[PDB]
CSV table of C-alpha atoms (C1' of nucleotides) and ligand atoms in Angstrom, one decimal:
chain,number,residue,atom,x,y,z
A,1,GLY,CA,-31.2,72.5,33.6
A,2,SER,CA,-28.7,69.7,32.9
A,3,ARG,CA,-30.0,66.1,33.0
A,4,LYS,CA,-28.1,63.0,34.2
A,5,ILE,CA,-28.5,60.1,31.7
A,6,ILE,CA,-27.1,56.6,32.4
A,7,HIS,CA,-26.8,54.0,29.7
A,8,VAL,CA,-26.2,50.5,31.1
A,9,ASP,CA,-25.0,47.8,28.8
A,10,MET,CA,-24.3,44.1,29.5
A,11,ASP,CA,-20.9,42.8,28.4
A,12,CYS,CA,-20.9,40.1,25.7
A,13,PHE,CA,-24.4,39.5,26.8
A,14,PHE,CA,-25.4,36.1,25.3
A,15,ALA,CA,-21.9,34.7,25.7
A,16,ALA,CA,-21.5,36.0,29.3
A,17,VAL,CA,-24.7,34.1,30.1
A,18,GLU,CA,-23.4,30.8,28.6
A,19,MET,CA,-20.1,31.1,30.5
A,20,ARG,CA,-21.9,31.7,33.8
A,21,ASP,CA,-24.1,28.7,33.2
A,22,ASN,CA,-21.2,26.5,32.0
A,23,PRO,CA,-17.8,27.5,33.4
A,24,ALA,CA,-16.1,25.2,31.0
A,25,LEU,CA,-16.7,27.8,28.2
A,26,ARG,CA,-14.9,30.6,30.1
A,27,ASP,CA,-11.4,30.5,28.6
A,28,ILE,CA,-12.0,29.0,25.1
A,29,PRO,CA,-13.3,31.0,22.1
A,30,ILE,CA,-17.1,30.7,21.9
A,31,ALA,CA,-19.9,32.3,19.9
A,32,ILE,CA,-23.6,32.2,19.7
A,33,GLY,CA,-24.6,31.9,16.1
A,34,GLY,CA,-26.0,29.6,13.4
A,35,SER,CA,-23.8,26.9,12.0
A,36,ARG,CA,-21.9,27.3,8.8
A,37,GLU,CA,-24.2,24.6,7.3
A,38,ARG,CA,-27.2,26.7,8.3
A,39,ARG,CA,-25.7,29.7,6.6
A,40,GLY,CA,-25.7,31.4,10.0
A,41,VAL,CA,-24.0,34.5,11.4
A,42,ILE,CA,-22.4,35.3,14.8
A,43,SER,CA,-24.8,36.8,17.3
A,44,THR,CA,-22.0,37.6,19.6
A,45,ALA,CA,-18.7,36.1,20.9
A,46,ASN,CA,-16.7,36.1,24.1
A,47,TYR,CA,-13.3,37.9,24.4
A,48,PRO,CA,-11.3,34.8,23.6
A,49,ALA,CA,-13.1,34.6,20.2
A,50,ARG,CA,-13.0,38.4,19.6
A,51,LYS,CA,-9.2,38.3,19.9
A,52,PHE,CA,-9.3,36.3,16.6
A,53,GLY,CA,-11.4,38.9,14.9
A,54,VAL,CA,-14.8,37.3,15.6
A,55,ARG,CA,-17.6,40.0,15.7
A,56,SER,CA,-21.4,40.2,15.8
A,57,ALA,CA,-23.0,40.0,12.3
A,58,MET,CA,-20.0,38.1,10.9
A,59,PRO,CA,-20.9,35.2,8.6
A,60,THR,CA,-20.1,32.0,10.6
A,61,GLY,CA,-17.9,30.6,7.9
A,62,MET,CA,-15.7,33.7,8.1
A,63,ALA,CA,-15.7,33.4,11.9
A,64,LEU,CA,-14.4,29.9,11.5
A,65,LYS,CA,-11.7,30.8,9.1
A,66,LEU,CA,-10.4,33.4,11.6
A,67,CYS,CA,-10.9,31.1,14.5
A,68,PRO,CA,-10.9,27.3,13.7
A,69,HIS,CA,-11.5,26.2,17.3
A,70,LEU,CA,-14.6,28.5,17.8
A,71,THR,CA,-17.2,26.7,19.8
A,72,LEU,CA,-20.6,27.4,18.4
A,73,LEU,CA,-23.7,27.6,20.6
A,74,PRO,CA,-27.3,27.9,19.5
A,75,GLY,CA,-28.7,30.2,22.2
A,76,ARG,CA,-31.0,29.8,25.1
A,77,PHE,CA,-33.3,32.8,24.7
A,78,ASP,CA,-35.3,32.2,27.9
A,79,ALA,CA,-32.1,32.4,29.9
A,80,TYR,CA,-31.3,35.8,28.2
A,81,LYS,CA,-34.8,37.0,28.8
A,82,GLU,CA,-34.5,36.0,32.4
A,83,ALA,CA,-31.3,38.0,33.0
A,84,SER,CA,-32.9,40.8,31.1
A,85,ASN,CA,-35.9,41.0,33.4
A,86,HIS,CA,-33.6,40.8,36.4
A,87,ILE,CA,-31.4,43.8,35.4
A,88,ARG,CA,-34.5,45.9,34.6
A,89,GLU,CA,-35.9,45.2,38.0
A,90,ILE,CA,-32.5,46.2,39.4
A,91,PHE,CA,-32.9,49.4,37.4
A,92,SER,CA,-36.3,50.0,39.0
A,93,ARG,CA,-34.7,50.1,42.5
A,94,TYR,CA,-33.2,53.4,41.4
A,95,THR,CA,-35.7,55.1,39.2
A,96,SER,CA,-38.9,54.4,37.2
A,97,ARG,CA,-37.4,56.5,34.3
A,98,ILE,CA,-36.2,53.4,32.4
A,99,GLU,CA,-36.1,53.1,28.6
A,100,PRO,CA,-34.9,49.6,27.6
A,101,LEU,CA,-33.4,49.5,24.1
A,102,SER,CA,-32.9,45.7,23.8
A,103,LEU,CA,-32.7,42.7,26.2
A,104,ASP,CA,-29.3,43.8,27.6
A,105,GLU,CA,-29.3,47.6,27.8
A,106,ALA,CA,-31.4,50.6,28.9
A,107,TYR,CA,-31.3,54.3,29.4
A,108,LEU,CA,-31.9,55.7,32.9
A,109,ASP,CA,-32.8,59.3,33.7
A,110,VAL,CA,-31.5,59.8,37.2
A,111,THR,CA,-31.7,63.6,37.1
A,112,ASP,CA,-34.3,63.6,40.0
A,113,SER,CA,-32.8,60.7,41.9
A,114,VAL,CA,-32.1,60.7,45.6
A,115,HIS,CA,-29.7,57.7,45.7
A,116,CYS,CA,-26.0,58.1,46.1
A,117,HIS,CA,-26.2,61.8,47.1
A,118,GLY,CA,-27.5,62.5,43.6
A,119,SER,CA,-24.3,61.2,42.0
A,120,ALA,CA,-25.0,59.6,38.6
A,121,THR,CA,-21.4,58.2,38.6
A,122,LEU,CA,-22.1,56.4,41.9
A,123,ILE,CA,-25.5,55.2,40.8
A,124,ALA,CA,-24.1,53.6,37.7
A,125,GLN,CA,-21.4,51.9,39.8
A,126,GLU,CA,-23.9,50.6,42.3
A,127,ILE,CA,-26.1,49.2,39.5
A,128,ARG,CA,-23.1,47.5,37.9
A,129,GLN,CA,-22.0,46.1,41.2
A,130,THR,CA,-25.5,44.9,42.0
A,131,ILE,CA,-25.9,43.2,38.6
A,132,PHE,CA,-22.6,41.4,39.2
A,133,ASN,CA,-23.9,40.4,42.6
A,134,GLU,CA,-27.3,38.6,42.0
A,135,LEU,CA,-26.6,37.7,38.4
A,136,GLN,CA,-22.8,37.0,38.2
A,137,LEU,CA,-22.7,38.9,34.9
A,138,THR,CA,-20.8,42.1,34.3
A,139,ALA,CA,-22.1,45.3,32.9
A,140,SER,CA,-20.6,48.6,31.6
A,141,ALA,CA,-22.1,52.0,31.9
A,142,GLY,CA,-22.0,55.5,30.3
A,143,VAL,CA,-23.0,58.7,32.1
A,144,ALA,CA,-23.7,61.9,30.1
A,145,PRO,CA,-26.1,64.9,29.9
A,146,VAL,CA,-28.0,63.4,26.9
A,147,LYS,CA,-28.8,60.0,25.6
A,148,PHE,CA,-26.5,59.5,22.6
A,149,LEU,CA,-23.4,60.6,24.5
A,150,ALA,CA,-24.3,58.3,27.4
A,151,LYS,CA,-24.6,55.4,24.9
A,152,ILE,CA,-21.3,56.2,23.3
A,153,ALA,CA,-19.7,56.5,26.8
A,154,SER,CA,-20.8,53.0,27.9
A,155,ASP,CA,-18.7,51.5,25.1
A,156,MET,CA,-15.5,53.3,25.9
A,157,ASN,CA,-14.5,51.5,29.1
A,158,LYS,CA,-16.0,48.1,28.6
A,159,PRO,CA,-15.9,45.3,29.8
A,160,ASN,CA,-16.8,45.9,33.4
A,161,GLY,CA,-16.1,49.6,33.5
A,162,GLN,CA,-17.9,53.0,33.0
A,163,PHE,CA,-17.1,56.4,31.6
A,164,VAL,CA,-18.6,59.9,32.6
A,165,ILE,CA,-18.9,62.8,30.2
A,166,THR,CA,-19.5,66.2,31.9
A,167,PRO,CA,-20.9,69.3,30.1
A,168,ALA,CA,-17.5,71.0,30.3
A,169,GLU,CA,-16.0,67.9,28.6
A,170,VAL,CA,-18.6,67.7,25.8
A,171,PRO,CA,-16.8,70.1,23.3
A,172,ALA,CA,-13.5,68.3,23.4
A,173,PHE,CA,-15.2,64.9,23.2
A,174,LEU,CA,-17.2,65.9,20.1
A,175,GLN,CA,-14.3,67.6,18.2
A,176,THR,CA,-12.7,64.3,17.0
A,177,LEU,CA,-15.8,62.0,17.5
A,178,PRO,CA,-16.2,59.9,14.4
A,179,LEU,CA,-19.7,60.3,13.0
A,180,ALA,CA,-20.1,56.5,12.7
A,181,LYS,CA,-20.1,56.3,16.5
A,182,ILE,CA,-23.4,58.2,16.8
A,183,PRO,CA,-26.3,55.7,17.2
A,184,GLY,CA,-28.2,55.7,13.9
A,185,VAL,CA,-25.3,56.7,11.7
A,186,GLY,CA,-24.5,53.4,10.0
A,187,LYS,CA,-22.1,52.2,7.4
A,188,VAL,CA,-24.0,53.7,4.4
A,189,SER,CA,-24.4,57.1,6.0
A,190,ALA,CA,-20.8,57.2,7.3
A,191,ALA,CA,-19.6,56.4,3.8
A,192,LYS,CA,-21.7,59.1,2.2
A,193,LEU,CA,-20.5,61.6,4.9
A,194,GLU,CA,-16.9,60.5,4.4
A,195,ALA,CA,-17.2,61.0,0.6
A,196,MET,CA,-18.1,64.7,1.1
A,197,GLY,CA,-15.3,65.2,3.6
A,198,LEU,CA,-17.3,64.7,6.9
A,199,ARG,CA,-15.6,62.2,9.3
A,200,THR,CA,-16.1,63.7,12.7
A,201,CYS,CA,-18.6,65.9,14.6
A,202,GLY,CA,-15.9,68.6,14.4
A,203,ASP,CA,-16.2,68.4,10.6
A,204,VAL,CA,-20.0,68.7,10.8
A,205,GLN,CA,-19.9,71.7,13.1
A,206,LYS,CA,-18.3,73.6,10.2
A,207,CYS,CA,-21.4,72.8,8.1
A,208,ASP,CA,-24.5,74.8,7.3
A,209,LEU,CA,-27.7,73.4,8.7
A,210,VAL,CA,-29.6,74.3,5.5
A,211,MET,CA,-27.2,72.3,3.4
A,212,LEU,CA,-27.5,69.3,5.8
A,213,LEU,CA,-31.3,69.5,5.5
A,214,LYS,CA,-31.3,69.6,1.7
A,215,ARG,CA,-28.7,66.7,1.3
A,216,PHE,CA,-30.2,64.5,4.1
A,217,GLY,CA,-33.6,65.6,5.1
A,218,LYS,CA,-34.5,65.2,8.7
A,219,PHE,CA,-31.4,63.0,9.2
A,220,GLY,CA,-29.3,66.1,8.3
A,221,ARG,CA,-30.9,67.9,11.2
A,222,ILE,CA,-30.1,65.0,13.6
A,223,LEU,CA,-26.5,65.1,12.3
A,224,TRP,CA,-26.2,68.9,12.9
A,225,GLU,CA,-27.7,68.6,16.4
A,226,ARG,CA,-25.7,65.6,17.6
A,227,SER,CA,-22.4,67.1,16.3
A,228,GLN,CA,-23.1,69.8,18.9
A,229,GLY,CA,-24.0,67.5,21.7
A,230,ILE,CA,-27.7,68.5,21.2
A,231,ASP,CA,-30.0,65.6,22.0
A,232,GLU,CA,-33.2,66.6,23.6
A,233,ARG,CA,-34.8,63.1,23.4
A,234,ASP,CA,-36.5,62.3,26.7
A,235,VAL,CA,-36.1,59.0,28.4
A,236,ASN,CA,-39.4,57.3,27.6
A,237,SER,CA,-40.6,54.4,29.9
A,238,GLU,CA,-43.9,53.8,27.9
A,239,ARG,CA,-42.7,52.4,24.6
A,240,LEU,CA,-44.7,49.4,23.3
A,241,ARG,CA,-44.1,46.6,20.8
A,242,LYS,CA,-45.5,47.3,17.4
A,243,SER,CA,-44.9,44.1,15.4
A,244,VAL,CA,-44.0,40.5,15.7
A,245,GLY,CA,-42.2,38.4,13.1
A,246,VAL,CA,-41.0,34.9,12.5
A,247,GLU,CA,-38.6,34.1,9.6
A,248,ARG,CA,-36.2,31.4,8.7
A,249,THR,CA,-33.2,31.2,6.3
A,250,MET,CA,-32.9,27.7,4.8
A,251,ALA,CA,-29.6,25.8,4.5
A,252,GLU,CA,-30.4,25.5,0.8
A,253,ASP,CA,-32.3,27.8,-1.6
A,254,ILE,CA,-35.8,26.6,-2.4
A,255,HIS,CA,-37.1,26.6,-5.9
A,256,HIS,CA,-40.6,25.0,-5.6
A,257,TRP,CA,-43.8,26.5,-4.2
A,258,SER,CA,-44.4,23.2,-2.3
A,259,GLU,CA,-41.1,23.8,-0.4
A,260,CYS,CA,-42.2,27.4,0.4
A,261,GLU,CA,-45.6,26.3,1.6
A,262,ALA,CA,-44.0,23.6,3.8
A,263,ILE,CA,-41.8,26.2,5.4
A,264,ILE,CA,-44.8,28.4,6.2
A,265,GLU,CA,-46.6,25.5,7.8
A,266,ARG,CA,-43.8,25.3,10.4
A,267,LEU,CA,-43.4,29.0,10.9
A,268,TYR,CA,-47.1,29.7,11.4
A,269,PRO,CA,-47.5,27.9,14.8
A,270,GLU,CA,-44.5,29.8,16.2
A,271,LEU,CA,-46.0,33.1,15.1
A,272,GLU,CA,-49.4,32.2,16.6
A,273,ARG,CA,-47.7,31.2,19.9
A,274,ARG,CA,-45.8,34.4,20.2
A,275,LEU,CA,-48.7,36.7,19.2
A,276,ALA,CA,-50.9,34.9,21.8
A,277,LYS,CA,-48.5,35.7,24.7
A,278,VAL,CA,-49.2,39.4,24.0
A,279,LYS,CA,-52.6,39.2,22.3
A,280,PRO,CA,-54.7,36.2,23.4
A,281,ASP,CA,-57.5,36.9,20.9
A,282,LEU,CA,-54.9,37.2,18.0
A,283,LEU,CA,-56.4,40.5,17.0
A,284,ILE,CA,-54.0,42.5,14.9
A,285,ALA,CA,-53.8,45.4,12.5
A,286,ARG,CA,-52.0,43.9,9.5
A,287,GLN,CA,-50.3,40.6,8.5
A,288,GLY,CA,-47.9,39.7,5.7
A,289,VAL,CA,-45.0,37.7,4.4
A,290,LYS,CA,-41.4,38.1,3.5
A,291,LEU,CA,-39.2,36.5,0.8
A,292,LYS,CA,-35.5,36.9,0.3
A,293,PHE,CA,-34.1,35.7,-3.0
A,294,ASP,CA,-30.7,34.3,-4.0
A,295,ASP,CA,-29.7,37.8,-5.3
A,296,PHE,CA,-30.4,39.0,-1.7
A,297,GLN,CA,-33.1,41.3,-2.8
A,298,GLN,CA,-36.0,41.0,-0.3
A,299,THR,CA,-39.7,41.8,-0.7
A,300,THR,CA,-42.5,42.1,1.8
A,301,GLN,CA,-46.2,42.2,1.2
A,302,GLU,CA,-48.5,43.0,4.0
A,303,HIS,CA,-52.1,44.2,4.2
A,304,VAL,CA,-54.8,45.3,6.6
A,305,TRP,CA,-56.2,42.2,8.3
A,306,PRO,CA,-58.1,41.8,11.6
A,307,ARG,CA,-56.8,38.5,13.0
A,308,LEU,CA,-53.9,36.1,12.5
A,309,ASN,CA,-54.9,33.7,9.7
A,310,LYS,CA,-52.7,31.0,8.3
A,311,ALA,CA,-54.4,30.5,4.9
A,312,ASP,CA,-54.3,34.2,4.0
A,313,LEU,CA,-50.5,34.1,4.8
A,314,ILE,CA,-50.2,31.1,2.5
A,315,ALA,CA,-52.3,32.9,-0.2
A,316,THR,CA,-50.2,36.0,0.1
A,317,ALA,CA,-47.0,34.1,-0.1
A,318,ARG,CA,-48.3,32.3,-3.2
A,319,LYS,CA,-48.8,35.6,-4.9
A,320,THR,CA,-45.4,37.0,-3.9
A,321,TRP,CA,-43.9,33.7,-5.1
A,322,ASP,CA,-45.6,33.9,-8.5
A,323,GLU,CA,-45.6,37.7,-8.9
A,324,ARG,CA,-42.1,38.9,-7.8
A,325,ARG,CA,-39.8,35.8,-7.7
A,326,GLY,CA,-38.8,36.0,-11.3
A,327,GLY,CA,-37.4,32.5,-11.3
A,328,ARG,CA,-34.7,33.3,-8.6
A,329,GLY,CA,-34.1,30.9,-5.8
A,330,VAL,CA,-35.4,31.8,-2.3
A,331,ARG,CA,-33.1,31.7,0.8
A,332,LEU,CA,-35.6,33.0,3.4
A,333,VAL,CA,-39.3,32.8,4.2
A,334,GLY,CA,-40.9,35.0,6.9
A,335,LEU,CA,-44.3,35.8,8.4
A,336,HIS,CA,-45.2,39.1,10.0
A,337,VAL,CA,-47.9,40.9,11.9
A,338,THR,CA,-48.4,44.6,12.7
A,339,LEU,CA,-50.0,45.1,16.1
A,340,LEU,CA,-53.1,47.2,16.8
A,341,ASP,CA,-52.3,50.8,17.9
A,342,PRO,CA,-53.1,50.9,21.6
B,1,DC,C1',-20.4,34.8,2.6
B,2,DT,C1',-23.8,37.0,4.3
B,3,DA,C1',-29.6,35.8,11.0
B,4,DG,C1',-33.5,36.9,13.5
B,5,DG,C1',-35.5,39.9,16.7
B,6,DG,C1',-37.1,44.6,16.0
B,7,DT,C1',-37.8,50.5,15.2
B,8,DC,C1',-38.0,54.5,12.4
B,9,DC,C1',-38.0,57.2,8.0
B,10,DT,C1',-39.3,58.0,3.2
B,11,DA,C1',-42.3,58.2,-0.7
B,12,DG,C1',-46.3,57.8,-4.2
B,13,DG,C1',-51.2,57.2,-4.9
B,14,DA,C1',-55.7,56.9,-2.6
B,15,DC,C1',-59.0,59.2,-0.3
B,16,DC,C1',-60.8,63.1,2.0
B,17,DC,C1',-61.4,68.2,2.3
C,1,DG,C1',-52.5,71.7,-2.6
C,2,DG,C1',-52.6,69.8,2.6
C,3,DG,C1',-53.5,65.6,6.1
C,4,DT,C1',-53.6,61.0,6.6
C,5,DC,C1',-53.8,56.1,5.4
C,6,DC,C1',-51.9,52.3,2.7
C,7,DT,C1',-48.1,49.9,1.2
C,8,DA,C1',-42.9,48.8,0.0
C,9,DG,C1',-38.3,49.3,0.7
C,10,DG,C1',-34.2,50.3,3.3
C,11,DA,C1',-31.0,52.0,6.9
C,12,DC,C1',-30.2,50.9,11.3
C,13,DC,C1',-30.4,49.0,16.1
C,14,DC,C1',-29.4,44.7,19.4
C,15,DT,C1',-27.3,40.0,20.5
D,401,MG,MG1,-24.0,44.5,25.3
D,402,MG,MG1,-26.6,46.2,24.4
DNA sequence: CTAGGGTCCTAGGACCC
DNA sequence: GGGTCCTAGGACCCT
């Protein structure tokens, strides 16, 4: 009863696309991200930039201190979406059991596959080769009996490689696995776990489930399970979008309601255009707004509402402005919609 | 020197039983 | 008191 899960993951995705489309960017340090003047961050970087320490989510000013010649690109999201659609269609040549997680990666359940004599190792390799043909981008892959190990495995031999974890290999792999490598255990959790002496899955195996449940709730059950290679989550090909949002961080903090309202007037057409692609009649379940202040606290207020409406978003933003700003400056304004259930 | 696109979980009061 | 909805906040995911 052992499944075969593939996780496929594009290498330096946004950057790989810009270098394919402009070969002049191949050997110099490049990064997709907002300028230092726009108070931006790095979305991703190529390997020449990463050598300097440039990483995703790094503030762009820090990226530039590490790497003064970093070439900064704004991003061509239709080009990334196009490559994304292409690799998903390549995935469909092998199975319909496809769960995309973002533009550039998916899980594949090839347990019941007929291709490559049932070899998941060879399927992953054929998919990676096919993506390099046809798109001229490289992908890495991970093969394992459950999702999270497959996703960990696709990181271990990148770029342009893969890694297979067999059931017999799972116990040795887990013993020294840092908890922070499990998808969904982030910096805050890893720090709480470290402070109680839990660094690796081997550390957590020596823990009582009941204690984990008390100290972490349902997360503690996930931790206990994952530390044993237990991950019964099925590959789900029927997930649907639940929200759509449009927000912007300004280059300077704003301090006047007129500035905030002016921001909303530019954001609203974008939100309407993106909703309409998926919901022509603009019918929704909730809509709402987001402010982030200069102390980086952020607040949202959203409410049941039947149909995208600009004035109500202005009105709600006005209240949030008056009622929870407390005289602080505002670095970000955002709009938001929750989509109807079906 | 701190983005923009999202998902999922938690938690208190409202409302319903 | 138990479901479920409503809303807010936050950890976390991707690039
Ligand atoms: Mg990637
Ligand atoms: Mg990815």
